[model samples]
Target chain A: SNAMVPTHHAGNGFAVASEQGRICALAARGQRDLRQCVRAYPSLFPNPPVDDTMLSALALSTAFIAPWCSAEQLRVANRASLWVTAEDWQVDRVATSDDAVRSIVSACQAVADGAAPDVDCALGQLLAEIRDELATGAGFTEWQPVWREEVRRMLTADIREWEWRHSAPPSFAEYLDNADNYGASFVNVSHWIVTGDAQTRSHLPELIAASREVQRILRLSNDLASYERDISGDLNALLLVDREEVSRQLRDRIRACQDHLHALEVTCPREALYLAREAGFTTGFYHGA
Target chain B: SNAMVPTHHAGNGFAVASEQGRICALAARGQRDLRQCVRAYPSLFPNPPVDDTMLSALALSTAFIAPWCSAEQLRVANRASLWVTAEDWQVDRVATSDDAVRSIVSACQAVADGAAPDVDCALGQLLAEIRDELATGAGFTEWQPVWREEVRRMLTADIREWEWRHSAPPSFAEYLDNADNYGASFVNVSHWIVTGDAQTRSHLPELIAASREVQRILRLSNDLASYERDISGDLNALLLVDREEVSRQLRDRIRACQDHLHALEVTCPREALYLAREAGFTTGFYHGA
Candidate 1:
């Protein structure tokens, strides 16, 4: 066993990142170069024009589970959280061309692939920061492909969601699958970097699956919470199914998370604690519904 | 960055493994019952009836890279190493059922997946040990599929090698592409566990490619070193291409690794040290050719 904890075993986004946000805020406040920090990276603040509440939500979404990481880990996760949220807005509201989004994604990939980056936004900066961090670190050597693949997958998932919104869409289950992929578990990825040893990493299915389950619940929670608001913003899984049935689905998923939480406890005692906290953390959104 | 030192950065495998083997030997020597140790776990320690030299070699090859890991990791990796080597022996000398190998592969996948194990050999035992270790440990929370996929890919590579032995096969270029996957970067997955934050994980391309490159170089290195022996036994990259050409490929690879040494130092200095040390460790094997 790697003796490291997986991200899900760490906790969920709302719970973990909320803590991280306080730290980010505390850390941000103490910075002597707050002016330079903001100047150098406006995209993180109000560059794209978002309210503090929404920005805090996005930042928390990304950094929640990273209490498992260091301060800089929290920093990058928090920043990247904002970056992707901003980029999503650009793809959704600002950019005229999918080509623009494609170019940006490619630029991120280039920097990730260790080539010189083309884009110079906060997105690229954080991506580059993380790239060097991982490369210099143990290379997080195993999950590297997962990081790249998840990026490709999440982007494609968004594109696919756009297709579903504009054209004949797939079924609820199908959308559910794609929606989970699109959530990217991106917030939890850094947690992955520090979780375990190489030899035992293959055995992380339960933890990862639970993380995915929580992510799905959260996405559906987003659908439930943002249903009316997102009707015209981004497609929701709730749209494809009967509203009553979608409600049932969300309830059932919340129950399953509960089941998984207990299973993790007995089967994987240490990580069970993480899952419990994740489940409890997500309870407000998932269980409430 | 996760700031973890890669295991190779920790030390060349043999030197590390020798330390582990001495511990294993000491642990074994102190055991109350070699009879029970052998009986309870017949799959380990030459239960197939080997003499000491071959026994020591199997122990070393299996345990060589493992001293870098925990006791359970060494146990599982070592056992799996012997299982595959034994299976490789079976494919070469006795059975030919791809389904047999398929079952074997499935067993590996199952263990990697954190499911109840289906095999009970040394292979299964070690796999289960690692799985529980990871599951219990911070849940080593990522890449269940990567492990399963690598297992499947490596098995197929060997199967393909067997096919090439009996029939027309792929081009040298094509084989090399698949060849790197066959090396099964299993050793480095944990480095990923400790790499910087998840945000930086996307930048794993260079390091992973380097791993694959090293894996390829090592596979061929194994061939070059074991060419005379394996020529009568299984196969080698040297067997597929012109011997003269294979030698040229070796030289170019050696040079690329040298270049990589400097590039890594500049781009990912800490990991560069890992790659450099790894290069040095792999030197006599790859460069000697």
Candidate 2:
């Protein structure tokens, strides 16, 4: 919550971007204060769904992960991330009934199928904007289908996950089957939409793997940070076996993403991989508590 | 543990099998008490791998899961269970070096591939017994591949899991992918070989799902009971969301399994389903502490 500032860069480090799409980290006076981050949410969506805590957290998270994206790209990416944050909340926390949740998810599924469902709610509005933001990616044309599929899967996973949350299937495997794709796919795909370039698109299969790896990295990092103290969730996924093993596992995956980064033989593999990991850091950072 | 005698049967529950194969739960003179369980291990393998706690625990676990299995079936299953328990220890605890662990796993993979790797560790001896036991199954011809594959996967998953365990993947999904079959498939397939009837062969797909479902149920119940108080695994798969939701999910999975039983068009789906759930109770039971 302190006025967040990075210590000196190690080298050229990552190129920091400004709000005006210029070359700067402190582009906007607005980006300076971590506390003020979420305050910007009310006017952006007026009746924004998330509270100040989540909003401020997202703003801080965005700043931590994307220090170099031009302030506008940062804004778009930040807003995109915020949109998903709220959508995730709406999917899992906000929508409490099966009928309501199913209807919300079905609408998302239909989006992928190229049809629109009839729904009027915060989720509906957010999904609309989420799609719009995704479409604005510099390489939207080639990546649109990829991104859309990820959205469809993420939404569907939420639905499935919600059902499991409502009533688990008695299988951790079943949980993983749906959860592996839970947010990593969409988050990384969303990352691509904003930060993707020749490097992002150069390697197809490997990049795809890398994107997923990053998603897991972020998710697990968040898990590691949360479970560090305790997971007060109803059905915690804590290893019933050993905790250090999990912490070790989480560390391994970070290295695994690095490995996957090297596994690629294509267009600028490490850049996107690096960026995804950096974004995932905010999760690790927020979870540091 | 006190004498875990079951209460009066409800509506003429599953017919109990012979203690030799039982009108009595504690028939085999060999099945006298927990203390003697591990003592028999020395004579059978000369140098048994597991200690008293694990051996006694295996005997208890086997007897619990296979109440109707013949004494021989139970014996074989119990030994088989012991094999896995020690092997799991070997992978995670005993074998300090990853190289030795991988070599051990490679040997297992070789056995599945129809070749014998020349190795003389405790694992090799167990593999020897495992292969011989598979040969004794009534459904060996139709089930050889199934049994072999499960062993292959379990071994591979362990090798993989140890990697993740040492350095966890970021996703619970990754954990479940390998851990699901960590000790399940071979154990279940062996159940069919020793205990399965014509009904077992009657439906392939439904039975397969039932097998995995049972595996999931047992694993989760075990996880639930242990992690219930507060997960303390090295890398606790604690929920990143809600705990009640998990309780709800586990309860739901049990129900889903019942629903799956109803969905089955097989002749004896309910019978096997009931049996599997009953077997899973041991996991839940042992884990209750």
Candidate 3:
């Protein structure tokens, strides 16, 4: 019995523990990179990163709690895609490709058709309201046909190129991916984190709150990282503010907001944590892998 | 009687039909300073004397035709107000106002309520179609809200300011004064010109053709006079070619077109001429006295 027992510990536990720590460190590093990337392109990540964290938590919890439920993941993916695509296109400088448009139309139609009763009802109503507002009420006499044509052309070309690149005919998923999944996951997670309600509100308080938070964080990070670049780029900093003291005060505000978000993450609920994790993973994978 | 008439020679009973060949010379010299009070903002008349010509024609025509009709003039005025206000706001980069959004909502409601069938049936349908296209089909999701809000706000403010500026509220007649009115009228007239029915097509062709001719001539003359000032002021030339070439081509085009119009005026039917004149006068004077 004594001979059979090992003289020294194998050190397997130490190696595994060390590897886990390394993985966590790498994940943190990835998070930082993501934060920077999002800061650089606010259009791509319209919501606050913290909101994404919350969404990730929700997605993970939903998935973990219902491991056999592919529908949940697919639903999350679909919803996220809609929000992202809509918001992204709304603020885009130019029109997107034909595939993107078709995907958006189809996705919206599907949601209107088959989404949970509450979601479907709200979305359908909103769409109808917007449609009526644009067509009859808007004061414009002529709608711009060129803009529409251009978008259609772009989407068509994009789909063809995507097919050639992937060596497969374009599908809904591929189209969504091309749109960066319509920033769907990003926007949905944002909505979930801020409002804590998956249903519509009579008032737009949640939307306003989410928008304010996202804008606050984005503006702060942008100023911190880009101040020097902006100054050198074309004396653009001077255009924003003339006095150094005032500019410094503005910069300090941004830094403070960023710090608040960092602190906020530590005490975030499990739901929030899951959202953060998923958001991090999705952003990382989509951008790179 | 023969003694009173200043007698010629009896043998030569010929009429005194000789043409006067007298070259009587008279010298008169006078100078009256050739002076006029110039406006404080001379630049307002960017094309100088040439703009004066167009203004004179516009003023004369406006004065002549506005008093003949009531409803039509009002309609034109409102349209002009809308177009001018919209264009001005667009140029100034002003955002759409909340009031404009309300107005749009109101208009849509009005249509839904079965008010203003002409607007509802014609303009309403077109607007609705475009709006739907943008909301559901167009791949401009990212910037849609921004564009919508901006345009709505701009147009609302424009209409409000226009109403305030005018002594009387805007009417359809005023709309006819806008540049876009010409385009709209052109479309309307093309139908009439082709069909020659008042209810169906009527005097539209003559109106469109004559207005176009006037616009072309006025534009050319304005360019010629303002060429030097425009180049210095960095004002973009209406012509798409090189400035030097444009100037040369403009002169040639203006002369040719003017000559062609003169010939047409002389040969065209009296009814057609009368219709053209009426449309021209109506367009010019629809604003007011």
Candidate 4:
């Protein structure tokens, strides 16, 4: 009777759970590495918001998104994601003026463009490290400029949104279009530049279009979920549009994003899966996934 | 007295005028080729706007923008630019429903993605021809996806602005963000993919970034010039922001654009020259130059 009880978990159901566990363990390893790196760069990540919890979450989320990638493969994504957190804090919470913000933008741009990292600017130094690591990747030559451009977009977006907060709030379209400020796409570019497969490397521009579509969806979802906490800022979706409309737009955007991914799913199955899962994971994550 | 004075035009001043004449003569040849192509596809360009004058102006502008290119080299730029005009007419003046607009977008996407040209759809056929020609270029294998994605962006931007016309006017930022609808960058990508030199081809992503910055500048400048004419549309810059603000924003954007180009000037001198010349050319052209 005990033998017939099926004590050992097996089959597709348990297999799926075990795979998830494997990914989570990989994520745990990454989180440790990321935490160490962040601590090493104390000046860059001095804020409480750039804490262990955030690093762990970013690592775990990225691992779940690209479970096929190894810990080393995931390092760029994790590091870039962590860097975004620190950069966000500096731009959103610490920077005193537009000039200060532009200085940060300029420093990061210089470093990303191959200038020697300025040690005085910890953000730029960390960015250079990430950029240099990405340079060692297989697709770096064709993709380096893309990665740099995404960095520029993300940084400039921060400045744009920073100004918006001080002025009249932008319209819903403008606010949503400014989702580069969220920095997910930049991290995604970093991840792809370092670890993308043949198909992904081949179809990067298409994949990035899909990624940006998914980014917009994630942006609205994040804004919707954290509306109360983020109401202090001027860019929340709820601040501009009604909950019903924002929800409707999310469904529409998700549909649009799927259409985008569908175009690439045949040629870039793994890349498409990463983006689709990213959308689903975060959509569910904000609700306690 | 005249025999010794200036029997012939020579030196830098007359040489400049003679070079301009040479480019204008090249422009005349391109205009003839473009006119024949447009006339061959009467169904696609069955509008007064897509006429001889527009073709001549487009060819002349392209020749002036890229004086180094031969007629064959300028063919893609001229053809792609002409297609944008037809597409703008179709989307802006003809397409009645959102469904119709989306169908056009979808068909073009399919055609651009290696689908056999639909005999029933002249636009798709024309686009497919352009795509096929562009595929014969050296950088097409690496840059085709970028070009295709730009097509998607331009198409989607058209859809977005189409919807905007039916709703409230988007803010200044949003209107400018939708500059992809203008399709200049699409032509720029086509031009670069086919005719770009080694440095231009190598630094395409960077060059395209600069092209977009230049595109935004062009969008704003074109809007500021054609404000009264475009006031019927909901997506004009002057309709959204005041004259002083728009003018001030243009200068700021031009400065920003130059900063973008400067970053690439050393490595991509001619590409940078093309974009800088493009900006200067259009900025002057709009004022009866």
Candidate 5:
């Protein structure tokens, strides 16, 4: 909680825009780096679903969340967030068979272990690059097991969601528990492993706990916000429960998430702030901000 | 394979028994060590399911598979195999809820990363010991990522199989693909990572490929052998397919597996032999040898 600074004031729009300007500059550097990298493999980043706007928005999201971090520090986070989109496309839209899904999961997993990505798999190729960039950080050796586990968690959830999409509707509890498919936690883990200070890295378990708590809230809020736009059969909390129940659960989960963040504020101030900022930003973004 | 020696003869029964005697000594030593470790955690090793015969049988399985390795060299493999049994008991019988299942997976995963086990979880406590033992091996740093990934794969398969047990039957191919739940691949990976020569560690992908091929054979064979004795609702290949189909697929897969093993024979002779031997032993065991 101490990480909160009162920077907002009535008629202080100019000062707030100044900070936004600085953050946008960092996002530009990130976008430039990403453009150069993704250009190397155009087939993987084919335009319709992965346009410049998506890249810009993703870069800006992390830039605003961790404004203290440099462009280089945020590079892995940005790429990883983008990688999640690529993987979701592959798993959700592109992969048609169980074997195809398994291949995608296996390839990314091999890349996670420092193997060379298969030549044709743009997804694994990009993930390999992101993993290499993150490995250069000081905390990689200490936190890599956590990093790899989150990667597995994310992939596991994706395949599980794939099953749900095809066959059965999961109960609301089952749907919420599958939040690793949302991927904010994986991206956050990557950011912290590379950019986090000793205090933050040492307190990773607590930080990740809070992050997952925040992830659940993000999941519910996204469901509420996107209900109208979602496909008829898409997995959404609103499809399973009434709007009132969704709002009520969101309120309860947000409070629980805040309790976790408040406990981590002193030890992992930056990480705590990052989680809180993303939760606030995404919650508002979903609410038409 | 060059690793195969012509040790058998019509009159060489005594010579074969001598080698068995030596391997049994190693298993005895492994048993003594395992008994010491598990005795330290009783609630986790409750009797009917976790008993001395199971421990001795598991110890002997690995001892016979890698007879060239010393007792110290085989300790991790022995403990990892035992840990798999403990985890199977917990996942299949002890745990009743998804939360309980997840707690078991999470605890073992944390221990794999060098975190201490919770005071109450013998499953994690034992895995921590196995992971620590494997960490002291020469190849731990190089192969730890692979090691951790297999842990995730095995756990993932277990949870998937748990769902299948409670719900609809998976297709035959789906059941075979989930062979990591058999845990042999995880045990084999641990063994090679700890006691394997440089060549063995270097050829891990090939070795693992062959081992998984061998695992599928072990799975189908067990199903064929145990159908009469198994519970009616239990998941076995026989439940999903006819005996003729199981045999047909087993024959095809064994040939496919042999192809993989032959490819590895030159580069990883011992590992290749290890796979073939397990296939031979388990196949015979299931055939009522």
Candidate 6:
């Protein structure tokens, strides 16, 4: 009888466009903050062929800021990443196109807020400072270079496996056997926020500084979020939780993390200016102004 | 340390192409058999509509059969379906395409042959005869009218729901939500197979007349192989039995059913053929094939 009831709450229910719009708006703001961070510290973030240590640092910074923003904000950012990735795959499967990589870059740009005046200027200034610091080996002492190197090695191996497993001339059977791994990558991002420690006093300011000092943090954050669901689902067993429990915890943790990140955004004057300017640009795009 | 070890059994370990090749061969044979079935029962197993029940049936049937077949068979069948359906959105999404229906047809075909001449033709002919009997009111005295009417109603409703659900307007989020009446239809098939008592049992004989009918019977006889896994996995709950004792009773019941069907398949040649062929064609594409 319960099965036959067709309850309103059963299954994946309908979501309103207004709710989606609100989430998207929050995501845009998060993107702007990330962009400001990048503009602030270009030296640390650098350009493509970015080192794994920089990527880890960026992930660490996001872990620090995630607890300050809203779940909706994170969802918006995450969804933008997913949309871009899916779009890219769609093109790749058909036209033998590399458009997906560009789409990923665009999504990264969303996180970085390239259009915000104050944030953009601050990002530029911060990157200059960090470049000088790294050159002089000033702030590099805060992180254990050895541990960073080790983690980078582990991550590279994992990513290489992923590429080998899913790329063209795909091991279709292998992919099927390990579909959860492929699918879970997106899920791992959210889990990382809950389980990984980067929000502590020791790790926070450096991360915050990194955000202000370089755009790499924003790029990594967007990449992680876009593929958060996939990664989480894949690495789920390591989190040591049941599927149903994980879903519940993920919803709560993502929300709490986002709220904290948003607060941090407000505290950082550079980030605030960056977000406002980016939001204004997005509003113009939406309105065709 | 164990996790970090790159042993032969590690997740990233290599597999020889030869190991995979044999399985692909089995899958190709299975696909060929399915094609033969289609050719034999053109009227019943016609080229599937844009949306068809056969696809879902095929998917479900394959899911059911996966554990029974060799790992190679399962892998091959799974890969073949994946390859065929990946490019087309309609085929990829259950809501849009009839891939599920086709999957069931393919699954049945895999188990349809054993050591017989023209297995497809014999099976198709038997089905045509059974369908004629069911239509003309020759067999099934007590429930003939009811069975006929119910089959018609189920097929019509299923097709109508699929069309309405997948229309440009799109009433339902997915086709499965709308076209799920087939689940009941399958249950009905199982029920009839067990309950129907005709002086000349038609459906059972057509199944037997096929060259590999004995092999088919033997495969079904070993139903307990997957019983526990199916219950634990929550694949389907249609088999009325205790979950804990699923393994114990499944084989016994299947064996008994096979014996009873075999008796009919072997004896009552003319009447059996008439019933088998008529009912077979009438039952729909996957069933007829």
Residue B93 alpha-carbon offset, candidate 5, angstroms: 79
List of chain B TM-scores, one per candidate: 0.66, 0.73, 0.32, 0.92, 0.90, 0.28
- Residue B80's lDDT in candidate 4: 92
Number of clashes recorded per candidate: 23, 43, 60, 0, 0, 79
lDDT of 2 by residue, A173-252 (tens): 35444644446556556666667765565554466666665665555555554564444353334543255755675667
Model 5: per-residue Cα lDDT over A1-289, one tens digit each: 5559532221122122234444545655678777876787676677876665567656656666676788888888888887888788788778889899988998898899878987788888888888878877746357778888999999999999989988939889999999999998999999888877677767888888888887898899888977876754568898789999999998888767766666666566667767877776566546531
- Which digits, one per residue and each the tens of the lDDT, describe model 6 over residues B153-235? 33444445445435543322232232223323322332233334574344443432331232222222223244465443322
Off by over 4 Å in 2: A1-289, B1-24, B27-57, B117-119, B197-199, B228-233, B239-242, B269-271, B283-289
For candidate 3, write residues A1-289 as lDDT tens digits: 9789643221222122222222222222223333343344454445743343423332322332222223322343333333333333432313355455456444444433333223333333333333333344322333223212223333444444344433523442232224322232233333333333222222223332332343333333233345566453311223344446434644564345334334443333222233333323222221221
What local distance difference test score does each model get?
0.51, 0.51, 0.32, 0.76, 0.75, 0.31
RMSD in Å for all candidates = 26.7, 27.4, 36.8, 30.2, 30.5, 22.4
- Residue range with the least summed lDDT across 10 consecutive positions in model 3 chain A: A9-18
Of the candidates numbered 3 and 6, which has the greater TM-score value? Answer: 6
Chain A TM-score by candidate, in order: 0.72, 0.71, 0.27, 0.92, 0.92, 0.25
lDDT of 5 by residue, B203-238 (tens): 778778777888889899889977876654578888
Q: Least lDDT summed over 10 consecutive residues: which range in candidate 1 chain B? A: B7-16
- For candidate 1, give the docking quality class from DockQ: incorrect
Model 1, span B218-243: residue lDDT tens? 66656666777765755567657876
Name model 4 segments beyond 4 Å from true.
Answer: A1-11, A197-199, B1-289
In candidate 4, position A34 carries an lDDT of 89
Q: Is the docking of candidate 6 incorrect, acceptable, medium or high quality?
A: incorrect
Evaluate every candidate with DockQ and list the scores: 0.01, 0.01, 0.00, 0.01, 0.00, 0.01
Which candidate, 3 or 4, would have the higher TM-score against the true structure? 4
Candidate 5 steric clashes: 0
